[PDB]
Curated annotation (Swiss-Prot):
The chain holds residues 333 to 421 of 421 of the full protein. It comes from the Bacteria. The lineage of its organism: Bacteria, Pseudomonadati, Pseudomonadota, Gammaproteobacteria, Enterobacterales. Residues 66-154 are annotated as: Domain III (functional). Disruption phenotype: Mutants lacking the tol-pal cluster suffer delayed outer membrane invagination and contain large outer membrane blebs at constriction sites and cell poles. Tol-pal mutants fail to complete division and form cell chains, and fail to process denuded peptidoglycans at the septum. Disulfide bonds join C96-C121. It is found in: Cell inner membrane. This is Tol-Pal system protein TolA. Contains an N-terminal domain that anchors the protein to the inner membrane, a central domain (domain II), and a C-terminal domain (domain III), which is the functional portion of the protein. The C-terminal domain is involved in interaction with TolB and Pal, and is also involved in direct interaction with colicins and phages. It adapts its conformation upon binding to various partners. Part of the Tol-Pal system, which plays a role in outer membrane invagination during cell division and is important for maintaining outer membrane integrity. The Tol-Pal system is also required for polar localization of chemoreceptors clusters. The system also appears to be required for the activity of several outer membrane-localized enzymes with cell wall remodeling activity. Is involved in the uptake of group A colicins (colicins A, E1, E2, E3, and K) and in the uptake of filamentous phage DNA. The Tol-Pal system is composed of five core proteins: the inner membrane proteins TolA, TolQ and TolR, the periplasmic protein TolB and the outer membrane protein Pal. They form a network linking the inner and outer membranes and the peptidoglycan layer. TolA interacts with TolQ and TolR via its N-terminal domain. Interacts with CpoB, and with the trimeric porins OmpC, OmpF, PhoE and LamB via its central domain. Interacts with TolB via its C-terminal domain. Also interacts with Pal via its C-terminal domain. This interaction is proton motive force dependent and requires TolQ and TolR. Belongs to the TolA family.
Amino acid sequence: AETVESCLAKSHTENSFTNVWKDDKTLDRYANYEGCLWNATGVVVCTGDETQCYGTWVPIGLAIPSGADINNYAGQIKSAIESKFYDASSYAGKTCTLRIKLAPDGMLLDIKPEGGDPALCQAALAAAKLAKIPKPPSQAVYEVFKNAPLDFKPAA
């Protein structure tokens, strides 16, 4: 078994988890993996149903009591948008949740804030509008992300 203190020492990981749940207050997204509790940070890209999310995952203590093509394209959307958020640490401590509109093209049709800090939400919109999102690898994967939820939760 892990201790709370061994968990907090694990390395951050870039990946997606399934069985994700949200805190509709903090707007935090969490997951249990290998006996630790993880929180999704940076830019976070979820499937339309918000069960599977790709983010920069950070451990915050002990756990609380297609397939590869989906995980891969979510990673590509995250990198395309987060690489344009040049001054993320200026919003450390803030969150914004947004929703996108994607074309089969990979073109960003639209993006809209849905909640969180107003100055971070405006910076997130500007970063997303600069992004060059690759084309989806398949119509099936496009349908999965064509209306995806996106969070920004920047680090210190």
